[PDB]
């Protein structure tokens, strides 16, 4: 029975959102593994199934509600519950397939999707790239609605994918990157919806390589650069962890800590 972090868009503020994400980062990581000031998520191979998941319960003004499940090892949405039905992305390996069986064990209808939660697949299903899908309280309230109505036969696949894209970013990506948390806080604060720019998209795409680059680094210095993009989409490169400290909040486990 996994811990449950609760958030509502109804009355949402920059502070309630922050406390939320903060509590989410705290449940993902014991905090035992910190390298170059950046906490590393628990390792997947050893992890006991009773410590593998975290539940996020979302609400909106409509008073609709879905519960997302996050993987403690990557912080990604792996599935969600709405009513008496639960839905999960196609897991890459077999080990992860097993683990999923321990989530929402009490509703009558379990389903596995015929697609992963990877952006390219989601973007295809939605008929829209991330840079064309607005983020913010508004969008979030709508995702929640659509995730819920999917379990009633109300929302079609395209809108579901879109909604996944919104939740994954405003939650998973924000947990991983403080820079992205900051992007969301700006919206809300000013009551905006806007699509994420290159600076955001490009980070969401390099979290994996970034983690490796830092963990395999030579006291911070990358073996080889990571390609990033500025707000205007101009290409650039990072070679050292010290410049990413304010940017990245969590790392996926790649290597063992260097003694």
């Amino acid at each position: 029975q996994y811990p449950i972090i609760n958030f509502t868009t109804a009355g949402a503020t920059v502070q309630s959102y922050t406390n939320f994400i903060r509590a989410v980062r705290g449940r993902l990581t014991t905090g035992a593994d910190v390298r170059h000031e950046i906490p590393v998520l628990p390792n997947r191979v050893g992890l006991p199934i009773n410590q593998r998941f975290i539940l996020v319960e979302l609400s909106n003004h409509a008073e609709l509600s879905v519960t997302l499940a996050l993987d403690v090892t990557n912080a990604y949405v792996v599935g969600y519950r709405a009513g008496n039905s639960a839905y999960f992305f196609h897991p890459d390996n077999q080990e992860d397939a097993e683990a999923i069986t321990h989530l929402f064990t009490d509703n009558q209808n379990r389903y596995t999707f015929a697609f992963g939660g990877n952006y390219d697949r989601l973007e295809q299903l939605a008929g829209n790239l991330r840079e064309n899908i607005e983020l913010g309280n508004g969008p979030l309230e709508e995702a929640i609605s659509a995730l819920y109505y999917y379990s009633t036969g109300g929302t079609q696949l395209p809108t579901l994918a879109r909604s996944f894209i919104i939740c994954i970013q405003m939650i998973s990506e924000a947990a991983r990157f403080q820079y992205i948390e900051g992007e969301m806080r700006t919206r809300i604060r000013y009551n905006r919806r806007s699509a994420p720019d290159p600076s955001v998209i490009t980070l969401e795409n390099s979290w994996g390589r970034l983690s490796t680059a830092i963990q395999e680094s030579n006291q911070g210095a990358f073996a080889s650069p990571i390609q990033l993009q500025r707000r205007n989409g101009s290409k650039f490169s990072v070679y050292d962890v010290s410049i990413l400290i304010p940017i990245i909040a969590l790392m996926v486990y790649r290597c063992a800590p260097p003694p």
Partner: nanobody
Amino acid sequence: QVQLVETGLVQAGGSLRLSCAASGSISSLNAMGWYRQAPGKERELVADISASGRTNYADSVKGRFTISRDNAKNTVSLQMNSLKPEDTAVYYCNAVGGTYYYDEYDYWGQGTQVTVS
């Protein structure tokens, strides 16, 4: 279990096409692209493209190289026109994928030499 295969001497200002096919457990395969390295220098992103149609291009090759992707057969193409001696390098195909994050795996090709002038 994911493999990359690279098919494709040219004179200055000529054209050339490079391909990269993917196969095996590529269900959540995301972006695919081409890097290059001139000995002693460094790896440079050249181009990449997401199955969803997002294309990136190094400044150097804008208006010269065109990258195309065929989803049906999980393959990527690189059309290289107006070649310069500066383009001379070992070119590497690259693929990224993952269901739980964009780049859970980061696979590289063995590389194909390209010589100009």
